[PDB]
Symmetry: D2
Subunit: 315 residues, 4 copies
Amino acid sequence: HHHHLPNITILATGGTIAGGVENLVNAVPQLKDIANVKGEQVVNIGSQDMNDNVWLTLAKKINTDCDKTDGFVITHGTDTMEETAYFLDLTVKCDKPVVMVGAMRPSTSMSADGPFNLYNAVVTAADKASANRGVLVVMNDTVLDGRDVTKTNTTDVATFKSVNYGPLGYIHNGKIDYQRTPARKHTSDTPFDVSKLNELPKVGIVYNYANASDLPAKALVDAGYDGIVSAGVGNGNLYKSVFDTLATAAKTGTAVVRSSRVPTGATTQDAEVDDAKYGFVASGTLNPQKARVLLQLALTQTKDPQQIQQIFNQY
Amino acid sequence: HHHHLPNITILATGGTIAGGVENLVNAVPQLKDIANVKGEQVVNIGSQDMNDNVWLTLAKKINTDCDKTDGFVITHGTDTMEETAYFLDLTVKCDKPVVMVGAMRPSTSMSADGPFNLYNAVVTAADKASANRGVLVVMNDTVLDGRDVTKTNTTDVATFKSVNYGPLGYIHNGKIDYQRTPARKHTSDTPFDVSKLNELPKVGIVYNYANASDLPAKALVDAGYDGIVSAGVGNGNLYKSVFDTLATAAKTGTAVVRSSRVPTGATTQDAEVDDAKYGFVASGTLNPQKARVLLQLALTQTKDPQQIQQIFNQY
Amino acid sequence: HHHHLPNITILATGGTIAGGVENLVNAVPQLKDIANVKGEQVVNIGSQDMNDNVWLTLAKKINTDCDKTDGFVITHGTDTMEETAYFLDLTVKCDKPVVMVGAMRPSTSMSADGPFNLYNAVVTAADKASANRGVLVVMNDTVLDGRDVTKTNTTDVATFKSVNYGPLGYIHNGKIDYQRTPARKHTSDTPFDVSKLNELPKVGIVYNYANASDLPAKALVDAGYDGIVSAGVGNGNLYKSVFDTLATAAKTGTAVVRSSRVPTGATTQDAEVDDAKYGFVASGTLNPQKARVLLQLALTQTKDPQQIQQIFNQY
Amino acid sequence: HHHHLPNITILATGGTIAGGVENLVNAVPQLKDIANVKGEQVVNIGSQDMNDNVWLTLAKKINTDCDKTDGFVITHGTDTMEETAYFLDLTVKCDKPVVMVGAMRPSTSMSADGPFNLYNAVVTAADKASANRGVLVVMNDTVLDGRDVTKTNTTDVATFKSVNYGPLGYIHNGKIDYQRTPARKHTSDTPFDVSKLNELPKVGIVYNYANASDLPAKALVDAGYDGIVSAGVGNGNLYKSVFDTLATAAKTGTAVVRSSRVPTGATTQDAEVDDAKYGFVASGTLNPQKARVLLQLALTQTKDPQQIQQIFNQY
């Protein structure tokens, strides 16, 4: 028995997080002890410039290249890693671990976090126990589900947290103790199939706050947007002028999801917004940016609010 | 020596939080043991409909009626209580405690939180030790500064937290142990004087996220808005199309503040956005809705970015 | 079809949490809308006086009375609710929901939390979706697993949190959205059978801190204790004098578990304590009081350290 | 004007946190850009072996060497850094910044945190704005007061948090934005003078939990201990057998402080323990290990419970 190591594929979307993509193994020599790593640059953007085209590219590349590898690590900027992770959570049909990883400090800074995050992302992708848990994010010693994971602090290396349901597992000395898995349907259990798409439905986000102008919302309407996500106040409430515009849009063919600017907690049914009455959809624990991801994919399949709510209740 | 009680004024902005405003003392009989309470309905709105006119009304009423009372408790909806609290923090010149209070459960529900929150808000307003600390929010046994306080959860009675610098004090058996006070200048130490205003500068908020449309921003520009606040990704980064529109607006007379959709942590100077170069202002720990409050008031005094940054560094 | 309600049994261990046990339904009339409630006083203690005899009594009563009811709610003091919940998690063989509930404010105080907590505990016990999740604690709108749940604050109504892995579900308008379940084996999947015991193995807890005396530990040894749990510093380290006494006890027939005074995070293997070498057991995420529960039950089955570690790796 | 740098003194208590003490400047070359660093090894222990003698040594060395330097950084193990920081907070009379720093990962590990923590500790010690704030801990980009700071997680680099009152400031690009300072009296404003002591009063900690044995407590009594700190359940309650022993000890010349095993929140007066009646002292937000520090120093000045409570109300 040759003691052989998993084949792990690193897909890079941006700059390096340790220190080019072919060189990652010399940046972090301990990688060669836990996997056989192949690197490919897919794109080279800053994740604040993340977009629908890169999401389609990643989902098709992983889906196409699933047989060629034992698992995937995606290097991504931290700003939108929580959006890409959820998109891939819903669209990846490969049944091998996909793990996203980033760094909150530059690779050339004192105590750069990139290198060890990358080690732990590879450990996670290599661990047969990581399978069947959806698309993961690995940051600061912790394995996080792609649905709940979010950036909680602007600068902290410990910023990534599953703020509503907690992490799946912690990583110590290259081993994971998993104690949870996401109940919401992901990966091969969703009907979201993007293999044949080169665009996604147009979904935009508007913010609520005292004195909020109806103009951003009206611009998305006037633009024909397929859906709008409201970053509501409190339990997904809307400023009277925004509510008026969205209530009109919902009765004239625009899908409307009520989310919350509030960083934890569900936008529920049965609070101060009669959703049945307005044709609205409640986002549950999906924050605006995540709610947008699911609304875009819900729109690839249905324009019916009652069917979108069911999708927001299951994924 | 007649053992006399402080005179406390309750200003109501909405529905009751215990159970009309004249009746609050029968809703919470223990009030009569700690103060002499007078109630006045100032407005009756849901706080998701909160606006510039109500803020002007409250600041002038407190400023005008300062001599008539020992302190103020304002009953307010939870959705925008963190915006009103910061506006009053910057605009109140009365040197007597102003405390804001709300309820996360209806007054008629099981275990309604309104009644005890109201008791604790009155205790806080009555406590000579509460003076000189700015405008406060009292929720869930805790005294919170108006600057840092925010709603962290959609439904939890413990939702209000000073997420960056912590609470000022905790409330047990009608006494407060204060261990902190806000360092940022407030109340009588700000130059913000609204006594003679009946409108505020037009300031709107745009959200960043993958594939973000430039259309909301362009609508605020086309509308002549005095300022725009960016709910950035990560450390106040902007999606390339939003950045393009805001960079143009900043060089053509629109004040632009970079904040973060990220619920804790500063939007700093000296990260990936050269603010000097674009004429932008970094919001620091001010979240978008709070950053809007300070930008509106900064605009009552100056249109100069470098002077707005100094204001964002001091208040 | 008569629309019939579940039969729910309330077992009381102490004073009332709403407002005697037969009267709970008049204290909270909305109960009659979701269940048929029967009350029994099992004991009447304050939970700071909680002990092995009450744990045996509850596990046998639930195990014996499983067929007679659709589920159980146990009213318990908050101080040790996290210990009883874990003991019942490991020892209950009934496959019907057992939910523990308490109150952080007296039933006669303003905004008493007891009543709604009790409503939500009954909702949880009634919900067929609550089955197969182990023994639960329901506090502040949240369903918590008995293993991870702990009291994080001395006075806050939101004190109960699953600080390492998060809650199982949130409770809104009498419905639960479950998104997690505990992976560690519980209830019918443990070998812990207490049906025929009237005592438990003697297990005590010692605290680490600078200058810590070896005398508490030596008193537990001199007393013949079957095991000792160390409330370690950091990653389950011990003060040199405590370590000396425990290292001696471990080689002379005393089971020794290293836990942490640190309120989150695992006491891991492979840090600064060679456990193999000392015959010690690492507690993982079990805090001292929880680690004691599992060590006591591990000792009903085995005295072998290597077998106790396996038990601490599986339950 | 030669642009000169502050003189900063590093006092080491253990192994290196970057990579001997004279070599720290080559381990972290950016130090030479912000200070003139001198290193001295005072002791070389692991902080789980921290003790009264090292505390006396550090307080006298800083007090004696105050004139010789612009500020101090102390390298310390993380396990007991929160105890030493509070002892120095109460005993240091130097009016120059003393900052404590540690590392949660070994200096030779991937992404070792030591180096940047050390940079930030020096920045903090160098910053004239750091003066008059007490003894500080600097970890993970954050400036923390010595009183409230505690280790919240066993392994996380972000473990150090001021869990009750928040941090004093955050550190970005070598600058601090301070927004708070501790209200409790520290450093030169305490009467604790240890200049002439070579021992401290004997103070031990006992843990509460279901079925807790009275034997640890009895061993501390039988040993003549000057005080005992109770790691209570909930709001500093005690298991009936522990309470009996402590109630006896308090009436026979042993100082007894009720703290809480609960990791946040005050052990209050006026809950379920009549402190006046038992001659007990409530620890407030002081956790057991911190409460021990203040009780030991309170005992250098007074044996009177009512005077110890006043000390626990002011420091």
